[PDB]
Every structure is written in structure tokens, then in C-alpha cells.
């Protein structure tokens, strides 16, 4: 007779990884590529040459 690992299973320590496994993150390609303006009004009016 001896203490098997099954007999001592309730005594065994646990460890948990300190950090989450996740993919890398990235921002919009649009805000990276294009010029942007601060809008103060909820609409900006833009004049375009037509003819």
C-alpha cells in the first residue's frame, strides 16, 4: 500500500496563467489613411466646382 496521485488529488496546488492569450489589435484603415477635420457642428458644408 502507498499514497497514489489519485489518493492525494484533493491536496494538489493550482496555478493560473498571469495574462490572457489574445490576438494583436489594430485601428481603422480609414482614420490611418485619410485626412480628417474636427467638426464643431454635426454637419460641414463643402463647395465643389461643378462646371
Partner 1 sequence: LPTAGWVTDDTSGAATGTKPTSKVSWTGKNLVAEEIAVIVPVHENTIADSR
CB of 34 to partner 1, least distance (A): 50
CB of 4 to partner 1, least distance (A): 8
Backbone angles phi, psi at 10, to 5 degrees: -70, -20
Contact track, partner 1, 1-40, x by CB under 8 A: xxxx--xxxxx-----------------------------
CB of 40 to partner 1, least distance (A): 39
What residues contact residue 44 under an 8 Å CB cut-off, 6+ apart?
Answer: 37
Question: Would you give the DSSP letter of residue 7?
Answer: T
Amino acid at each position: 500500500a502507498d499514497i497514489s496521485r489519485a489518493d492525494a488529488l484533493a491536496l494538489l496546488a493550482t496555478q493560473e496563467l498571469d495574462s490572457i492569450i489574445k490576438p494583436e489589435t489594430s485601428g481603422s484603415a480609414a482614420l490611418a489613411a485619410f485626412r480628417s477635420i474636427r467638426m464643431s457642428a454635426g454637419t460641414v458644408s463643402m463647395p465643389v466646382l461643378a462646371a
